[model samples]
Target: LRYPPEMPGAEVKVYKKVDNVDLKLYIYKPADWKPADRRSAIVFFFGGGWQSGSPAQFRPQCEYFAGRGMVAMAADYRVGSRHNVKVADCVADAKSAIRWVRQHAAELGVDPQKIVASGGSAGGHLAACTVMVPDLEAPEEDHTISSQANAAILFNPVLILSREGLKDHVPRQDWEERLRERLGTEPKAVSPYHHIRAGLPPMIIFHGTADNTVPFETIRLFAEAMKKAGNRCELVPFEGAAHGFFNFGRGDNLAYQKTLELADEFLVEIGFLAPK
Candidate 1:
């Protein structure tokens, strides 16, 4: 059963509603935040390969950004195991969440144009897709407000769902079948690498070189594709780390600290955050 997650001081708000389910955002803001401050914002989606996820997955990151003076949120979206939905619905929900934040920017004290979409693994794909996949807006949405992202922060995202992802285009039935089961759409149709084009938002990806869940090679090519499209993409490789290696609150906090430092630096360079 999905329950209201424990977030120390987060303000919970409904971002979307469907079938009596209220998709929520657990938001965090700086202590001095004002509704009219127009600060930068970020919303994170959790990763569970679209099978399941908890909004709490991003709690620490939200707190970190909030302390740094940005409005940060952890978004709840439908998943296959809980909602019996397909990946397309997940994409739609992500887009809807972004649009909702942008639509309510004024009251939320957001800049409207500087929102960053961020997440881990499957959630990372959602973050990337909000800018890359342009056609999955939910049917009930207003459609006039754009689900625009100023940038993206991805953690071990699944970028390629098929062989078409590679420059050489070699087929891999194993990957094709695996993603097909999750995607419920043509494998390549939702693949982030296949949707590459110029003018997409700048992004920084942190991936474990040892992650078997999402191979480092996929992001290697993804960064290549980003460069070809004349976009700035940074892929931070954690040598010998595995899947979920960057999660905070884990004992010792090795990878998490490193990734956060890099992300903080990136945010500052991009004009999203002021130097501390």
Candidate 2:
């Protein structure tokens, strides 16, 4: 599927400068937004197996949240095809975006305590990593501002990078070697499943049981780990749904509407959104 164009009324802000290249956040705010308002916000990353994708992938979601009276943004990050970088660079960009938002929360009219990290598939991994990974901050960025998100909303996220989680998607032969070539030593360091601990942010995941790209078992295990660690994790399954089921212009809008409804409920339950 082709990536959609950015929604109208988005204000672009450069969050990071990588080798003189500007990485931006396409921000969307509510119509009644004000600098004095301490509104909740969400930042989203696009998914393409960490190889290819655009910030535009989440434009509709941004618009939806913005319409619901929140600040929403779709962030640009380094990807293999565009920047010739690896997964580490993707992760670094994710963290930087979060930190930048938190650092400028007052000016952006965002509540520093209500910033949520969100994405789908590989992008979801990066979103989860911002809260799960201990130290993937860019050396050039300020450390005083935290990169950790207050909550997470993932869509078919790849939470485990081990052989067990990736066997179905990756080739069996030389899988680890190929993975290391792209992700470097200790790839598990960035795996959300391996990093789950107590007191982390609450998370809600939407996934398809029939997804071949990212196995449902991975998300199941991730939710289990989150609960075991004393964090809130809700897993919503879509029967017979495949990857990208929640995406706009797909699946007759059934999955999309259901996912959005469930997501709204989860946000309200967590106090991110008020009851309608």
Candidate 3:
């Protein structure tokens, strides 16, 4: 039930069954804690352009949140290359994770009322999907729990899938295939920017102005859309920072310090953490 103190507690919970396949979730709870806090829990997903990624990649982040007095979970879902990989499959996994967290809230010591979903890059897409797709509720056994979160914390999230971003040297050989599988799709349904709705949770989005991987404009557009929808949202643009730069932490690092300071402020503002 517990992993070593230095290691974030990792466990797998199987949720749904489709065909002969199984949908399992990789959960990482904080190390050395009683289930008494009933603290807020975060279910995170990793991003690899929606084609490749693993839950294990987010261990450090899970540990960071666990150390900060919150329950954290990292999930593994089918990617584009996996069996029957499609946008719908990834979205289904995300929906399932949120449902599971809420359904098992009491057992996991999670405050079902204050659940948050987060991730970076493509994982951000999944996090946003869990929040945006109001129709994608739990169709399985966890239908009693709400799939929505109280907030969303994203790191350099790819909010849009439009060609509005600057091209990043697409490979010639992979160009046609990627266009067919990724780019050619409608930007509205696939991009988070296209899915904003009213009465949603407070959103905390962090992005680097210098990011080239997923265009900074995408997040800007998302923030604008949220504002237009009258939803509560905040955007922190790091000066001169690159994509995925927020993963590194503070202490001896100024970049990390700046990012964490903003994040801490946002968390406190959203009532996720006590003010320092």
Candidate 4:
């Protein structure tokens, strides 16, 4: 659900509504902006193991980017929380959102060429996968929003073949059975590592060394592959933190500060922000 526009410089609008479920994208553009002007845009997906999550969860991050003079959007995709919220459905939603943003870029004061796709956890996986392996000849639906991403900023992303992922980490009973059933013979197609190739977008990956949920090795191995494929990639491993450490609030926390410092440094290096 979108919030009421009680606060200055914030507007909430419902992008797409389908049946009982509504897929919304929040926009926080800077005040006093003309539609003719172009600005960078960030499309963010919230993380919930792909099956569950809401765009509202990334409000803080969205606000951060919007406050920095960039057009920020927190996108919502289909999830298991409702019916027909399978992996394919979520992927379709991700693609659709990208297309939607592109189609309405001018209206939203966004520069179509300067869009960045980002998210955390499963959502991170979606952003990375959608950008890395977009459906080039996707049929026109609702104006055909382009799913391609110019660059990526991922947080504790899960980027590995499900076969290797399942083999390395033991899942609880519920997910274990589901994995075996859904994965079948080919699990590589669902993995971001399987799609790593040359000429892909530049990426900045943030992961915690102690992340048990998505194995640190998965991201590391993927980074190595990216390097070999001649793609620009940077990995920052937070030593003693677990998954979602960057989400923690408060500057006093060591983990929080460290993650922000690295993130800010990378953003500056990538020219997303002005250097101090």
Candidate 5:
């Protein structure tokens, strides 16, 4: 479900229609966009602990990337608050969004090989899952179209959902059981930490050292796993920043600007964006 009139320069596209629900993608493209052009593209998911959130969370990022000549989209997915779905459903929706974009790349004026996945927190987890998880595609989706992202940008992502990663949030004695019960799925089955393997997409993660929601230490471990798996993974620490500090209006917008600037630099370094 989405709001009316949409944002200026953004158009809504129904990417998934199931169970009488229409999941949408708010797309923002360059002014001179054309179907024949094979421009780079990025899709972002919003963070809300898989409980609640809106696509609008990444509107600013979409607008920014569009201005940089890339096709950008902010995706909408089912969440616990509205859809009563589990983490598995969120992963499915994320994979569906990536596959839809790739399958329709020609019409969307995007390069199928250059699609980037990004998001914050739980949304970040979904973005990473699209590339890390090999079998979470939606049943209604066309499996021939790939859902793997060329690169990933994660912000305070919940990459490790096991007891070690979530110990700070859940009591040590009950964390494992709680996670297993809450996810309704095995923790290691979907955890990016446990699934790290060579040949996965290059990744860049931004985490605040002060973040208590998703521990910074978990991100450190995940990044280490990525490097050990022979993939490029960069971790940018925000000295004293807290969880969600990079969000707009948080920390007086300083962290948001700083993180976006570094993200742009990472994109450039990875050849996803040209030097400006």
Candidate 6:
């Protein structure tokens, strides 16, 4: 348990290997975990503009969720900085991680049907893509196991990328070049907003109103679209806060705990966790 230092879990496993690089999943299991038990699981994807960050980014939440009686994990995926892949490739990796969890459910002591995905920023976008955008799985990966998440916990994610941003700095105008650089395919092809449909899993987004990186309005629009499509999506806006406010150990005092508290209530409300 002390091996990871920052936060160690039950064990680590190679979920998949891409380009000869082993993608490992750091799984956190409850003290009472048993192979026969079908506990719900939540997998965390670290936030870093889809190009940076490590699995430890969500270690605290993963540990807390494990204590809350869910099998939780923090997974490592390829990114531009290390793997030289684009945002679309990150989507492929995200789907692979979710599918890996479900496919190994019995041994991991998890319920394939109740898997939840959680991430922040671009990683949050990847989380949403797991359930929304359909065909981004890795080249020739097995598709027998579905990568659908029962729910998602998003923190200031980039759900829309082809419209207004910060009132004046619209993505269509200001971000066209950057979007082209980061995304190889057409922007709408990977945009979760463009892929919205009915029958998707429930989701909750925690965003800071003053966030300039990925505007809150885009997430607001995403929530509206989800509702119009007859799905469940909750948008929790933090007044006057900036980007990365929900991350742990920031100077924002208690934003991390505040968001996690709401997340606790959400999981309970959705029957993923029982009340104390």
Among the numbered candidates, top TM-score falls to: 1
Per-residue lDDT of 194 in model 5: 76
Cand. 4 TM to true fold: 0.84
How do the residues 208-240 of candidate 6 rate in per-residue lDDT, one tens digit apiece? 999888778788878998999999899999998
Which segments of model 6 are wrong by more than 4 Å? 1-7, 164-177
Which residue pairs does candidate 2 place in steric collision?
none
**Candidate 3 local accuracy as lDDT?**
0.70
lDDT of 6: 0.84
Tens-place lDDT per residue, model 4, 1-276, is: 233212334465565555576677778886566798687778888887666666766676677667676788888776765555555556667766777777888898878877788888878887887778544223446534567777788888867746553335534424334653333235566578878899898888889898878778778888998999999889888887688887746334666556556755766677765555
Worst 10 residues of 1 by lDDT: 169-178
The digit string of per-residue lDDT tens for model 3 on 1-276 reads 111122335666776666566666556666565666677788878877777766765666676677777787777777766655666567777888888888888888777877888888878877887787545443554555677777888888766654445334322323124533643245555556666788788878888898878667668877887988898888888877787776645325566556557766777788886665
Those runs of model 1 whose alpha carbons end farther than 4 Å from true positions after fitting are 1-4, 165-179
The weakest ten consecutive residues by lDDT in model 3 span: 1-10
Model 4: weakest 10-residue lDDT segment is 1-10
Q: lDDT tens string, model 5, 150-266?
A: 899998998887654444553233324354655746777678887889988888899999887887888897888789989999999999888898887787888898888998898
TM-scores of the candidates in the order shown = 0.94, 0.93, 0.81, 0.84, 0.92, 0.92
Better of 3 and 6 by TM-score: 6
**Alpha carbon lDDT at 157, candidate 5:** 91
**What lDDT does model 4 reach?**
0.71
| Residue 70 local lDDT, model 3 | 76
Better of 2 and 5 by TM-score: 2
By lDDT, the best candidate is 1
